[PDB]
Motif scaffolding. Structure first.
Motif, PDB file in Angstrom:
ATOM      1  N   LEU A  92       0.563  -5.034  -3.266  1.00  0.00           N
ATOM      2  CA  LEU A  92      -0.230  -4.935  -2.047  1.00  0.00           C
ATOM      3  C   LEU A  92      -1.000  -6.220  -1.802  1.00  0.00           C
ATOM      4  N   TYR A  93      -1.489  -6.844  -2.878  1.00  0.00           N
ATOM      5  CA  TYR A  93      -2.116  -8.156  -2.767  1.00  0.00           C
ATOM      6  C   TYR A  93      -1.128  -9.210  -2.298  1.00  0.00           C
ATOM      7  N   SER A  94       0.076  -9.209  -2.869  1.00  0.00           N
ATOM      8  CA  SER A  94       1.063 -10.218  -2.519  1.00  0.00           C
ATOM      9  C   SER A  94       1.609 -10.029  -1.113  1.00  0.00           C
ATOM     10  N   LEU A  95       1.505  -8.825  -0.551  1.00  0.00           N
ATOM     11  CA  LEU A  95       1.949  -8.629   0.824  1.00  0.00           C
ATOM     12  C   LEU A  95       0.843  -8.856   1.850  1.00  0.00           C
ATOM     13  N   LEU A  96      -0.338  -8.284   1.640  1.00  0.00           N
ATOM     14  CA  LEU A  96      -1.314  -8.241   2.716  1.00  0.00           C
ATOM     15  C   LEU A  96      -2.518  -9.141   2.515  1.00  0.00           C
ATOM     16  N   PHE A  97      -2.884  -9.455   1.278  1.00  0.00           N
ATOM     17  CA  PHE A  97      -4.129 -10.157   1.008  1.00  0.00           C
ATOM     18  C   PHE A  97      -3.917 -11.612   0.621  1.00  0.00           C
ATOM     19  N   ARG A  98      -2.698 -12.130   0.761  1.00  0.00           N
ATOM     20  CA  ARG A  98      -2.514 -13.568   0.616  1.00  0.00           C
ATOM     21  C   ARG A  98      -2.962 -14.301   1.872  1.00  0.00           C
ATOM     22  N   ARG A  99      -2.618 -13.774   3.041  1.00  0.00           N
ATOM     23  CA  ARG A  99      -3.019 -14.369   4.307  1.00  0.00           C
ATOM     24  C   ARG A  99      -4.454 -13.984   4.648  1.00  0.00           C
ATOM     25  N   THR A 100      -4.846 -14.257   5.872  1.00  0.00           N
ATOM     26  CA  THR A 100      -6.124 -13.812   6.407  1.00  0.00           C
ATOM     27  C   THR A 100      -5.983 -13.112   7.748  1.00  0.00           C
ATOM     28  N   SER A 101      -5.131 -13.627   8.635  1.00  0.00           N
ATOM     29  CA  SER A 101      -4.863 -12.934   9.888  1.00  0.00           C
ATOM     30  C   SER A 101      -4.116 -11.636   9.634  1.00  0.00           C
ATOM     31  N   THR A 102      -3.208 -11.648   8.656  1.00  0.00           N
ATOM     32  CA  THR A 102      -2.523 -10.428   8.252  1.00  0.00           C
ATOM     33  C   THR A 102      -3.505  -9.440   7.638  1.00  0.00           C
ATOM     34  N   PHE A 103      -4.503  -9.951   6.914  1.00  0.00           N
ATOM     35  CA  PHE A 103      -5.569  -9.114   6.375  1.00  0.00           C
ATOM     36  C   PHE A 103      -6.376  -8.436   7.471  1.00  0.00           C
ATOM     37  N   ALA A 104      -6.752  -9.192   8.507  1.00  0.00           N
ATOM     38  CA  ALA A 104      -7.535  -8.625   9.603  1.00  0.00           C
ATOM     39  C   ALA A 104      -6.729  -7.608  10.396  1.00  0.00           C
ATOM     40  N   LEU A 105      -5.454  -7.909  10.642  1.00  0.00           N
ATOM     41  CA  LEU A 105      -4.586  -6.975  11.348  1.00  0.00           C
ATOM     42  C   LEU A 105      -4.371  -5.701  10.536  1.00  0.00           C
ATOM     43  N   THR A 106      -4.261  -5.845   9.212  1.00  0.00           N
ATOM     44  CA  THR A 106      -4.084  -4.697   8.335  1.00  0.00           C
ATOM     45  C   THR A 106      -5.319  -3.809   8.312  1.00  0.00           C
ATOM     46  N   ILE A 107      -6.514  -4.400   8.231  1.00  0.00           N
ATOM     47  CA  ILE A 107      -7.694  -3.545   8.227  1.00  0.00           C
ATOM     48  C   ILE A 107      -7.950  -2.947   9.604  1.00  0.00           C
ATOM     49  N   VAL A 108      -7.468  -3.578  10.681  1.00  0.00           N
ATOM     50  CA  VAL A 108      -7.519  -2.942  11.998  1.00  0.00           C
ATOM     51  C   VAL A 108      -6.630  -1.702  12.037  1.00  0.00           C
ATOM     52  N   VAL A 109      -5.397  -1.823  11.529  1.00  0.00           N
ATOM     53  CA  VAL A 109      -4.474  -0.685  11.500  1.00  0.00           C
ATOM     54  C   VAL A 109      -5.027   0.438  10.631  1.00  0.00           C
ATOM     55  N   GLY A 110      -5.572   0.081   9.469  1.00  0.00           N
ATOM     56  CA  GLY A 110      -6.200   1.066   8.609  1.00  0.00           C
ATOM     57  C   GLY A 110      -7.439   1.700   9.210  1.00  0.00           C
ATOM     58  N   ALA A 111      -8.204   0.936  10.000  1.00  0.00           N
ATOM     59  CA  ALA A 111      -9.414   1.471  10.615  1.00  0.00           C
ATOM     60  C   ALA A 111      -9.084   2.489  11.692  1.00  0.00           C
ATOM     61  N   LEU A 112      -8.081   2.203  12.526  1.00  0.00           N
ATOM     62  CA  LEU A 112      -7.675   3.177  13.540  1.00  0.00           C
ATOM     63  C   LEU A 112      -7.049   4.420  12.907  1.00  0.00           C
ATOM     64  N   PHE A 113      -6.222   4.219  11.872  1.00  0.00           N
ATOM     65  CA  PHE A 113      -5.573   5.330  11.177  1.00  0.00           C
ATOM     66  C   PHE A 113      -6.596   6.244  10.506  1.00  0.00           C
ATOM     67  N   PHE A 114      -7.510   5.656   9.732  1.00  0.00           N
ATOM     68  CA  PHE A 114      -8.542   6.428   9.067  1.00  0.00           C
ATOM     69  C   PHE A 114      -9.567   6.990  10.040  1.00  0.00           C
ATOM     70  N   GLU A 115      -9.768   6.343  11.191  1.00  0.00           N
ATOM     71  CA  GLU A 115     -10.592   6.906  12.255  1.00  0.00           C
ATOM     72  C   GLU A 115     -10.048   8.243  12.734  1.00  0.00           C
ATOM     73  N   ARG A 116      -8.754   8.275  13.056  1.00  0.00           N
ATOM     74  CA  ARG A 116      -8.151   9.516  13.529  1.00  0.00           C
ATOM     75  C   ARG A 116      -8.121  10.583  12.434  1.00  0.00           C
ATOM     76  N   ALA A 117      -7.793  10.182  11.202  1.00  0.00           N
ATOM     77  CA  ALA A 117      -7.724  11.152  10.111  1.00  0.00           C
ATOM     78  C   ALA A 117      -9.104  11.686   9.745  1.00  0.00           C
ATOM     79  N   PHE A 118     -10.135  10.849   9.860  1.00  0.00           N
ATOM     80  CA  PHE A 118     -11.487  11.300   9.595  1.00  0.00           C
ATOM     81  C   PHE A 118     -11.975  12.239  10.679  1.00  0.00           C
ATOM     82  N   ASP A 119     -11.552  12.020  11.933  1.00  0.00           N
ATOM     83  CA  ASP A 119     -11.860  12.975  12.998  1.00  0.00           C
ATOM     84  C   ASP A 119     -11.253  14.341  12.710  1.00  0.00           C
TER      85      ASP A 119
END
Ligand SMILES: CCCCCCCCCCCCCCCCCC(=O)OC[C@H](COP(=O)(O)OCCN)OC(=O)CCCCCCCCCCCCCCCCC
Ligand code: HEC
Ligand code: HEM
Ligand code: HEM
Ligand code: HEM
Ligand code: FES
Lengths: 101, 48, 75, 378, 57, 238, 65, 98, 140, 108
Positions: E7-34
């Motif tokens: 997971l580090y080698s895929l998503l946390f090597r970059r930085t723009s990919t990191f921001a896009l990933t936490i955006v996707v996770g934030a929307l996903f966990f937003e809906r699931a938390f609702d």
């Protein structure tokens, strides 16, 4: 009298606290320009020992870690080395005031 | 200056690096991924 | 007072390790709770005895208020 | 080299919030500066929304605040957040003052004067906003404390009938109070930045009192993440008091329209004036009472000239430390006493509390510093 | 550990990919938390709501 | 005088994540409608605020097209009534506090917006005063005062309305005394706090977000601070 | 259409220190009865046992609703 | 110029015209029960018209002269002995007594 | 003496507070006078100032036990609201034992003093409550 | 030596208002900056007095402005100062911008 005054002083030196952070008399003095002048007038090696004691004490109060029993600084094995320096600072400041006035 | 040795930190480390013979490679990226996954989860909470 | 003209220091060596390799919480249940017990035992003799005086004052105040409220004659 | 070291604004941000040396053994009692800053700006923003739904009129004010609580989406959370944020503001303020008196940081004269100016200003802002919702407690407390200001002879009497806009409380008094409750916090924020400037000139103070010139660490990222964590605990407690207990600090005498005839026997203000108001009415003298109150906060001004130890902390003066905790208990006693009605034991222990307050401050602390100055072969 | 490493080698090597990933996770966990918050709050009452009794009127 | 404290009663919304009983709020609105709406006012509650608590759209339209409102101007301008769909308040039974005060032997009833929240005691107070009438042990009661101890001075200018003319719960609830008192006190709790269910929902979400987010931030603070916790000094002179 | 208040206020306090203070209330009631225009109105006892009996009302009422 | 500006601004912060416009009132006296005060609003303040009893005329006769810390006789204060009419505000701090 | 123990048992327990603490400090002063009198009578302190120190130590420990025990007695009785249980005085005796151990600056003395002082204080209240006669019948 | 060079506030005032090296060339076209600043604080002051006598209810806003101009003492001079001080504020704004363009100071 005096045989009991020493008991009071040793109780206060136990309950003071800086015996447990490995400090001494001259490690806690609040400063004006005069006490910092007394710091400036020190020998080099004593000043090195003072800055190392200060930096250890700040580290051990940074992780809030009192030293063990082995290095609690005992009462009356500490040097009152700043007594001549600070005493002459007293005398010089009073000389300035009482001579210019 | 020759006798400058480091006082040990064997009480403080993680067991993936605590060995004195292992290559520190596979213990590195997993460690970085753990800390950065912590930061990412915090960022998810703050963004929400 | 910026950073670099502070003091003159010799004879000091600082060692420190990376934040990654040492763990997050080193023995947080085997050092921290005896540590806070030592912290508590070093302070409550100088903090606690006034507040029990306040608690006694509070009990005495409410009690004497109600006793001066209640009257009891007999005729 | 870097724009972070050449650009004129970035000189300010760089030499303020990044390249500032710090004492390294900071406890959890220095987060309160950042907490007071965040409490201040959150008060400003929630007040700004409240001003975007408020109508200052002496007949429609309370109805309009009810209209905010009902017919606005989440306006109840914004009203409750402004009130409980004022509460957490004074909580963090007294924590800040207690630290700044405890660890000997009152050896910084200029910052201390600027701070006491801020103390007056935040008390004035909170009082006037407490008047604003036109509740019963607001109306009668306004009458009482403004006549307390009318205690001073020949210069102040018609001055108080002048700030009344007549002889009473009226629309003029309401809009005066709305104007000042709006415009004081921006002067407060400017003085906060001046306070900050003098402290950045002198440098902070470690909890040992030793000058920490060999143990400076940068502000980023250590105190940044520590203040963000402290702010998140603050936001937790703020959301606690706006989502579970509004009634733990509210007032039943505030949620009625100011019918100026009833005078309910419950008359106490909220707690952050209750210790001050207890010092008032434990003396049977009006002008003497207001002079005693102002002189108590002037005792808080003339703290540093009383200081005659040789070590600046109170970690290392144990009897002085105990007298400090007695002072804290006596302040809490004043708070609870002002939060009561008036009968015989209440009057007695109120006189006790005020006179022991001045006795502990003006007398006991320099005598303690002298005796444990003398008991160190000094 | 390998799942952290990949997971580090895929998503946390970059930085723009990191921001896009936490955006996707934030929307996903937003809906699931609702979804989870709705379910747990309706489970803690179950007989006091307005919804199921208003469509049982 | 002698001060009395109401005991705490196990209400439905006493719990920290507890809701209200919306069915009880419907019949409590019915209770306010029938008998209590003669003297007391509750003007800050419009009929549209009933839509998700105690009634539907249509039933509220019937309830609010019951009463005339006296709308403002028209071609003549002066005086004409209006049915009104939803945006009418509760139509002020005593049009002035002077006319309210002369309607009784003084002592006009306060409005019922904030009675549960603003009487130094919650709904326990209101339930206790509403149900607890009793006989005087040698007091005066000057011609317009009744004896009911949960009240400062114990002298009330209100006729005891609780069991006189029970009001036929239309949902089919047997109108006893304490049940109708519980109903109207829950309805006044709702009228005092029109946000209680939603605020405890956001309290639920906030508690779960602080069970989540706070160990993360604390872990990261301890991580970045782990260098200075474990840095170690050593003293080299010559 | 019979209330439960009557039932629980009768059944709870039945023989109790509440009834002790009821007899104390009867004692001060006849104390007032043997006196012309007293000050002690015998109301203090009324408040404090009704305080106690309504504590026991507070413990054991809401099942019946 | 500065003292004119200060003077005109303080007088701008004074009051309104009709706030200074007070009025003369007439109150009917005998609408009040015995031993009881009625308050009618006038000049902003409440206005006390209180029926003191003949027992309270005797209690005004039961008032010591100098033990009043503001020592004043009753005829120095009232005009008719049985009806009393005063300003409805306690003059210390603007409270209204019960 | 009979007078001060009777003062201590006069007050209902119950909330008529801090008189209990002052009476327990009088208990401490009496106990310290007894122990200090025998101790300076059977030591030859050499010299008298150290004897004053020893007497002050014993009286201060006994008075501190009394003060802490009276405070926790009153506080526990106010909190638990049950003026008949002996368990509050069990907690009180353990608290007094721990503070005795801390003024003597040890651990094991404090824990054993907690156990024995708690059980004996429980026996004291338990016998005063059910009714066990003080020191005699002396009848048959 | 002096407070002005050793005090942290008068360092800033000394480097803004006193030891600021000014060019010895500027005509009256450069006066509009300080005039904008003084007009700004004067607008703050007159508006603040207006705010002490104003009721933002739309049915009574017009009457409130009327009562300002009539019965509040000097409310007419305060209101007229606020409105036409806004007018002169924009006049000095336009002369400030025209200065900063025509005299080529827009290289910054
Ligand atoms: C809140 C109530 C007190 C909480 C508390 O723990 O206070 C004690 C705390 C520590 O006291 P201190 O002796 O300075 O620290 C141990 C190292 N010597 O004391 C402190 O941290 C002192 C700083 C706070 C002083 C003001 C307290 C009242 C506000
Ligand atoms: C007209 C008659 C009514 C009716 C039908 C009800 N109330 Fe009551 N009420 C009325 C008056 C004139 C007064 C004032 C008396 C006084 O000031 O003592 C009251 C008082 C109350 C209160 C007051 C408690 C307080 O002031 O703290 C409450 C809570 C109250 N009334 C409630 C209430 C309810 C719930 C009713 C429906 C059952 C009700 N009243 C009927 C006049 C009248
Ligand atoms: C208006 C409210 C206040 C704000 C926003 C405020 C803000 C701050 C900030 C941000 C700091 C630096 C952070 C810190 O040292 O913890 C600070 C430090 C300080 N403040 Fe304040 N402050 C306020 C009120 C006061 C008051 C009333 C005083 C007392 C006169 C005061 C005295 C101090 C002192 C002495 C320090 C230095 C403490 C130290 O370095 O140990 N402040 N303040
Ligand atoms: C400049 C920004 C501010 C504005 C515009 C503002 C505006 C308002 C308004 C409109 C109200 C009435 C709303 C209400 O109380 O229901 C209010 C109330 C209040 N304000 Fe402010 N305010 C501001 C800053 C502050 C600050 C800094 C404090 C102090 C911490 C404060 C303390 C209060 C208090 C205590 C109340 C009464 C709260 C209540 O009882 O509900 N305000 N403010
Ligand atoms: C922050 C301080 C200020 C406050 C408190 C304030 C307040 C007010 C108020 C209450 C009014 C309504 C009174 C009226 O319209 O006659 C008003 C009007 C006005 N203000 Fe301000 N104002 C402030 C600053 C300014 C500034 C800096 C300007 C721009 C130069 C400005 C421009 C205006 C204008 C153009 C009007 C309209 C005048 C009119 O139409 O009657 N104000 N202001
Ligand atoms: S006595 Fe202080 S206001 Fe009436």
């Amino acid at each position: 009298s005096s045989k009991w005054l020493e008991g009071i002083r040793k109780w206060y030196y136990n309950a003071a606290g800086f015996n447990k952070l490995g400090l001494m008399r001259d490690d806690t003095i609040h400063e004006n320009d005069d006490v910092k002048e007394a710091i400036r007038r020190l020998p080099e090696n004593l000043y090195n020992d003072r800055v190392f004691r200060i930096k250890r004490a700040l580290d051990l109060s940074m992780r809030q870690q009192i030293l063990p029993k082995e290095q609690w600084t005992k009462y009356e094995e500490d040097k009152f080395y700043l007594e001549p320096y600070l005493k002459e600072v007293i005398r010089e400041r009073k000389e300035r005031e009482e001579w210019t006035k | 200056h020759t006798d400058i040795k480091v006082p040990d930190f064997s009480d403080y480390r993680r067991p993936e690096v605590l060995d004195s013979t292992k290559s520190s490679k596979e213990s590195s990226e997993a460690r970085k991924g753990f800390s950065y996954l912590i930061t990412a989860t915090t960022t998810v909470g703050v963004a929400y | 007072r910026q950073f670099g003209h502070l003091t003159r220091v010799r004879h000091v060596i600082t060692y420190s390790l990376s934040p990654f390799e040492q763990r997050a919480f080193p023995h947080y249940f085997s050092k921290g709770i005896p540590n806070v017990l030592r912290r508590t035992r070093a302070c409550i003799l100088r903090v606690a005895p006034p507040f029990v005086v306040f608690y006694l004052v509070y009990t005495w105040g409410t009690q004497e208020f109600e006793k001066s409220k209640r009257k009891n004659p007999a005729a | 080299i870097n724009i972070r070291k050449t650009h004129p604004l970035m000189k300010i941000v760089n030499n303020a919030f990044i390249d500032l040396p710090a004492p390294s053994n900071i406890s959890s009692w220095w987060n309160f500066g950042s907490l007071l800053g965040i409490c201040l700006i959150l008060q400003i923003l929630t007040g700004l929304f409240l001003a975007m739904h408020y109508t200052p009129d002496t007949t429609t004010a309370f109805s309009s605040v009810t209209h905010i609580c009902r017919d606005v989406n989440y306006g109840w959370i914004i009203r409750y957040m402004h009130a409980n944020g004022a509460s957490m503001f004074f909580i963090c303020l007294f924590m800040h003052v207690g630290r700044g008196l405890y660890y000997g940081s009152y050896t910084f004269l200029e910052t201390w004067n600027i701070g006491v100016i801020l103390l007056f200003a935040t008390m004035a802002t909170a009082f006037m906003g407490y008047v604003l919702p036109w509740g019963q407690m607001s109306f009668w407390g306004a009458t009482v404390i403004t006549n307390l200001l009318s205690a001073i002879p020949y210069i102040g009497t018609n001055l108080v009938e002048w700030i009344w806009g007549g002889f009473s409380v009226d629309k003029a008094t309401l809009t005066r109070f709305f104007a000042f409750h709006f415009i004081f916090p921006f002067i407060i924020a400017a003085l906060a930045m001046v306070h900050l400037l003098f402290l950045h000139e002198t440098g902070s103070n470690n909890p040992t009192g030793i000058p920490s010139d060999t143990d400076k660490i940068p502000f980023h990222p250590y105190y940044t993440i520590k203040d963000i964590l402290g702010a998140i605990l603050l936001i937790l407690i703020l959301m606690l008091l706006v989502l579970f207990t509004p009634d733990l600090l509210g007032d039943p005498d505030n949620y009625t329209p100011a019918n100026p005839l009833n005078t309910p026997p419950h008359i106490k203000p909220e707690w952050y004036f209750l210790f001050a108001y207890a010092i008032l009415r434990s003396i049977p003298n009006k002008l003497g009472g207001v002079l005693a109150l102002v002189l108590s906060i002037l005792v808080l001004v003339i703290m540093p000239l009383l200081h005659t130890s040789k070590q600046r902390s109170m970690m290392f003066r144990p009897i002085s430390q105990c007298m400090f905790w007695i002072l804290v208990a006596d302040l809490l006693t004043l708070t609870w006493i002002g939060g009561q009605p008036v009968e015989h034991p209440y009057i007695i222990i109120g006189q006790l509390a005020s006179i022991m307050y001045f006795l502990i401050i003006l007398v006991m602390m320099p005598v303690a510093s002298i005796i444990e100055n003398n008991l160190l072969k000094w | 550990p390998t799942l952290t490493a990949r997971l580090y080698s895929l998503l946390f090597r970059r930085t723009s990919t990191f921001a896009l990933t936490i955006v996707v996770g934030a929307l996903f966990f937003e809906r699931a938390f609702d979804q989870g918050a709705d379910a747990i709050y309706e489970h803690i009452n179950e007989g006091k709501l307005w919804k199921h009794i208003k469509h049982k009127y | 005088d002698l001060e009395l404290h109401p005991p705490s009663y196990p209400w439905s919304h006493r719990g920290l994540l507890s809701s209200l009983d919306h069915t009880s709020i419907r019949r409590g609105f019915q209770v306010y409608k029938q008998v209590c709406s003669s003297c007391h006012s509750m003007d800050y509650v419009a009929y549209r605020h009933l839509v998700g608590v105690c009634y539907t759209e249509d039933e509220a339209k019937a309830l609010a097209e019951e009463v005339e409102v006296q709308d403002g101007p028209n071609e003549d301008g002066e005086m004409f009534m209006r049915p009104g769909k939803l945006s009418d308040y509760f139509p002020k039974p005593y049009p002035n506090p002077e006319a309210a005060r002369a309607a009784n032997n003084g002592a006009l009833p306060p409005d019922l917006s904030y009675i549960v929240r603003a009487r130094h005691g919650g709904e326990d107070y209101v339930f206790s005063l509403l149900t607890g009438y009793c006989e005087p042990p040698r007091v005066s009661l000057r011609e317009g005062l009744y004896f009911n101890p949960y009240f400062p001075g114990q002298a009330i200018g209100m006729a005891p309305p609780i069991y006189n003319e029970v009001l036929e719960f239309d949902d089919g609830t047997p109108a006893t005394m304490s049940q109708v008192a519980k109903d109207v006190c829950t309805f006044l709790r709702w009228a005092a706090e029109p946000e209680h269910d939603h605020r405890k929902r956001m309290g639920l979400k906030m508690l779960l977000m602080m069970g989540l987010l706070l160990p993360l931030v604390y872990a990261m603070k301890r991580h970045k601070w782990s260098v200075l916790k474990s840095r170690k000094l050593a003293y080299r002179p010559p | 259409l019979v209330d439960p208040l009557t039932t629980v206020r009768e059944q709870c306090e039945q023989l109790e220190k509440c009834v002790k203070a009821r007899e104390r209330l009867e004692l001060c009631d006849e104390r007032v009865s043997s006196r012309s225009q007293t000050e002690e109105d015998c109301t203090e006892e009324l408040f404090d046992f009704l305080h106690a009996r309504d504590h026991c009302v507070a413990h054991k009422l809401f099942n019946s609703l | 110029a500065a003292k004119n500006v200060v003077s005109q601004f303080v007088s701008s912060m004074s009051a309104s015209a009709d706030v200074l416009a007070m009025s003369k009132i007439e109150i009917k006296l005998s609408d009040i029960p015995e031993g009881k005060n009625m308050a009618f609003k006038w000049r902003g303040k409440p206005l006390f018209v209180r029926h003191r009893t003949k027992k309270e005329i005797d209690q005004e006769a039961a008032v010591e002269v100098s033990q009043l810390r503001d020592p004043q006789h009753d005829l120095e204060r009232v005009k008719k002995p049985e009806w009393v009419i005063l300003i409805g505000v306690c003059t210390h701090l603007g409270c209204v007594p019960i | 003496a009979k007078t001060l123990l009777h003062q201590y048992w006069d007050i209902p327990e119950g909330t008529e507070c801090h008189r209990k603490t002052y009476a327990a400090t009088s208990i401490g002063g009496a106990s310290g006078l007894v122990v200090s009198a025998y101790s300076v009578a059977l030591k030859t302190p050499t010299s008298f100032l150290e004897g004053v120190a020893r007497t002050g130590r014993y009286t201060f420990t006994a008075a501190a036990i009394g003060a802490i025990f009276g405070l926790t007695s009153c506080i526990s009785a106010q909190v638990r609201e049950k003026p008949d249980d002996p368990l509050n005085y069990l907690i009180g005796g353990c608290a007094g034992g721990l503070t005795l151990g801390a003024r003597t600056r040890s651990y094991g003395i404090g824990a054993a003093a907690c156990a024995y002082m708690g059980l004996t204080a429980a026996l004291v209240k338990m016998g005063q409550l059910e009714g066990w006669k003080v020191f005699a019948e002396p009848k048959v």
